[PDB]
Write a protein that binds this ligand. Structure first.
Ligand SMILES: Fc1ccc([C@@H]2CCNC[C@H]2COc2ccc3c(c2)OCO3)cc1
Ligand SMILES: Fc1ccc([C@@H]2CCNC[C@H]2COc2ccc3c(c2)OCO3)cc1
Ligand SMILES: [Cl-]
Ligand SMILES: [Cl-]
Lengths: 504, 493
């Protein structure tokens, strides 16, 4: 669906309006033509209309097709690619490539196949062809879309229609971007409630981190804005409830998951952790209640309000933050730590997925923080029959008290962690490209949340008048529209194709 | 098409178009109405901005009406009126005033929607045009204007047949290699031109053909030099000249039946009008200079004796032309204007019907002074082959006193188009090239050394001036006609 009044506000500007934007824009190849979907699209259209660039473009497309193809189709696709682009007599022979590069891509069947070739294709495209793009009408059209992207799109642009979750500080709504029809979730954090409980830093950290990360295993931020009452984060719609809910509340007499299902989630969570750790961000809040399912059954991590982004030269942070019983010993002992803490929380998360209780507490046990801290430091975890030898070994490797001994991020990746035999039946390629059929597909009829009639109301916040510092802070927060998700939306909903006209 | 030269037709990077942008001095009329590529890009612009849809479609439908077969007109008028002009019309043009609308809804006739079109184009020339200049479409126009100015000299043209030989040179049938378009190429030998002092005539012809754009005058498309020649690439006229058709087609029956002569006269008149409206006197109208194309439509050619009057100047002097076709005022060494061309039209027409000139008997060669004496002093007689109308028309054109001669008045030949000779000509269809010509030439029919010359600065410089390159309107037409423009105007295949 759509609404035509808001749709009518999506129009491409005159060129003279784009002059300021052109001078202040980052012209990096990677940032413009590879990472930004409208940039990439316009760059490809440019390549498509200039014959000399056809081989490069088509090779690029055919590598991406090979990368995301079923295992059964791959050998044949590799044969066709080779014959089309890497045979010297072929119509679309890629003669710009180094002969060495061509000879290596003609050989082998290993998991690395065509990655080096792709790097050479993109390194070529980044030179003269990109320079021609910049001097073409397709680059100017990109500026028009960037101008449109930067226009005011706050609260009036969204139509809520249902509550998805809520906590102490506000609600998450399923909403609709009125112009395009795209379904999103909107986190509304109440201003007064946040001022009272000193929650500003957390709201800001999450917003910044979600704006700059782009991963299929982490919820994305598409817009950020304020209203009279709230600070609003418009993000990936996740309809399927959180993992805590699916452990305890769904099939109550069978709490916890079968092992294949828990392994799948674990793999998806690992992939999202890795994405953060490669960007030097420590999550610090991994737990079942912050892992969310979408409609297809795939999961994403969420709530980045406690995350730390390391600066260059900094390998560790420090401090008490997170949830009792997901916090690692190094953290509880007051030591500096890196990403290791997230993998300890991964262990606790998996334990709970299989066992339907924490590893440091009995069912329903509520203990003093100091007693819980002692158990985490000193008490060996025990595993019931529900754990297979591989489940158990993996948990043991993550719940290792010494961070140096714990499985995790090494040599810039989680590749070592992936060889653990727990994951022996996971095709990582298809996992990372979102191709694997999930183990549980949520029901469209069903609300995976607390019944609205059973939600405790919160008292009103009295006498928190807003000073200048609050209002200035609200304006910093409301940085508006995030480029990559906004471009994805325009393309997905057909607005791009509709407005990207030339000769109707 | 030849891949090799087709490959050279590539749109430039935008940065290469900066100088052109800076020096280009075009208004709405020059850019979006008169230049076929600007008009096309301007219409493309309008088609993508929904608010300009009514104006764009109305414009196209008027032009569609103007060039429609008479049988299709009642219904085209009907549909246009119901779509744009009637009270709750879906494509109502609110920018028009009510008087313009009411009048366009009333009546029939030829200029039925001319006032309306004038109003549509005046509106489109204001804000819609300004918006166009701030669009990608205008930049694309600059890119085509850049391509238009690139060197396209002799190597771009394949010769394949001789169409005529003259004194100064030859006309070849040729083919633009990149587009495959057929043209005629007139090559004037440099050394003969110098030795016989024909520079003036070559330059004058080139300038004039470059600044005229009529379906009744050979169109100049490219002008360039080679080592041996000055070349003019122009409308291919394959069907022979009128002298040839009068005297050589059916030898036992020379001359044309009257309706055929009148058709050609109407076309000739329209060419003359086009020159006289631009202040040019032709001065060499005669059957040998009027050529037929493949369809049997004619155009005037050989503008080497022409003269363009300076702004303000209304008469000129100078002995030039062909004996028998020169008017008395010219023969008498007086100042003259466009009137000389009309005298020559009378002679031309007379000869089309009579298969001889009005002043000499069949095969009769006379001293120039005996012929001068006749043109100045003798009344022309008319054999029985002339209807009263054609005699009356010839008489009016052959008046010895230019003040009494039928010709060009009030900026046009409308007064002349009114003569009863032309009662069966539909001027609209003629002016538009829709009328089925009376004679259709066959393809299978072939209707048809200098020493001691050394060149200097002054010569090679004259040569370089002459090689001005490509003429915008005919080039743009070529690009559209042959599909090159369409091929290089795609955004997303
Ligand atoms: F302010 C707050 C509101 C709601 C909560 C929820 C409490 C229970 N566990 C999940 C928490 C996050 O809820 C969601 C649900 C769907 C979403 C989403 C986040 O982002 C994309 O789609 C936490 C904080
Ligand atoms: F240099 C010269 C060559 C030939 C002549 C010819 C002499 C006989 N009568 C007509 C003269 C014009 O010849 C043509 C023929 C085809 C044409 C053309 C002109 O222009 C476009 O296609 C004049 C001058
Ligand atoms: Cl371009
Ligand atoms: Cl535009």
């Amino acid at each position: 669906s759509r609404d035509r009044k808001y749709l009518a506000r999506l129009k491409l500007p005159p060129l003279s309006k784009c002059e300021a934007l052109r001078e202040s824009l980052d012209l990096g190849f990677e940032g413009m033509c590879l990472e930004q979907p409208i940039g990439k699209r316009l760059f490809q259209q440019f390549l498509r209309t200039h014959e000399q660039h056809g081989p490069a473009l088509q090779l690029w497309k055919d590598i991406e097709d090979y990368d995301t193809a079923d295992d059964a189709l791959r050998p044949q696709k590799a044969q066709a690619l080779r014959a089309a682009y890497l045979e010297p007599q072929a119509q679309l022979f890629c003669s710009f490539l180094d002969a060495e590069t061509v000879a290596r891509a003609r050989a082998g069947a290993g998991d690395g196949l065509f990655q080096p070739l792709l790097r050479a294709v993109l390194a070529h495209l980044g030179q003269a062809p990109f320079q021609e793009f910049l001097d073409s009408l397709y680059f100017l059209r990109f500026l028009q879309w960037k101008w449109l992207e930067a226009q005011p799109m706050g609260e009036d642009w969204f139509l809520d229609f249902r509550v998805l979750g809520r906590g102490g500080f506000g609600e998450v709504f399923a909403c609709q971007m009125k112009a395009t029809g795209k379904l999103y979730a909107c986190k509304k954090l109440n201003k007064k409630r946040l001022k009272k409980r000193k929650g500003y830093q957390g709201a800001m950290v999450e917003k910044k981190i979600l704006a700059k990360v782009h991963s299929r295993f982490i919820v994305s931020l598409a817009y950020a804005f304020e209203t009279k009452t709230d600070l609003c984060l418009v993000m990936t719609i996740m309809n399927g409830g959180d993992i805590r809910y699916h452990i305890y509340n769904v099939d109550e007499d069978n709490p916890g998951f079968q092992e294949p299902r828990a392994i799948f989630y674990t793999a998806q969570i690992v992939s999202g952790l890795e994405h953060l750790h490669q960007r030097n961000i420590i999550y610090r809040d991994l737990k079942p209640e912050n892992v969310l399912l979408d409609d297809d059954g795939n999961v994403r991590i969420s709530d980045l309000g406690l995350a730390v982004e390391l600066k260059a030269g900094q390998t560790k942070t420090k401090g008490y933050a997170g949830t009792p019983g997901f916090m690692a010993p190094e953290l509880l002992l007051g030591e500096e730590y890196d990403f290791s803490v997230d993998y300890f929380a991964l262990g606790v998360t998996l334990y709970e997925m299989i066992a339907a209780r924490g590893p440091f507490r009995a069912r329903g046990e509520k203990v003093e923080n100091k007693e819980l801290k002692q158990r985490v430091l000193e008490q060996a975890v025990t595993y019931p029959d529900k754990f297979s030898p591989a489940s158990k070994d993996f948990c043991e490797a993550l719940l290792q008290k010494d961070p140096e001994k714990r499985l995790g991020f090494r040599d810039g990746s989680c590749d070592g962690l992936r060889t653990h035999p727990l994951f022996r039946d996971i095709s990582w390629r298809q996992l990372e490209a979102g191709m694997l059929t999930p183990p549980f597909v949520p029901d469209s009829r069903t609300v995976y949340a607390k019944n609205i009639q059973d939600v405790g109301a919160f008292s009103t916040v009295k006498g928190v008048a807003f000073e200048k510092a609050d209002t200035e802070f609200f304006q910093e927060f409301a940085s508006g529209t995030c480029p990559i998700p906004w471009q994805e939306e325009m393309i997905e909903t057909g607005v791009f194709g509709d407005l990207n006209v030339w000769r109707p």
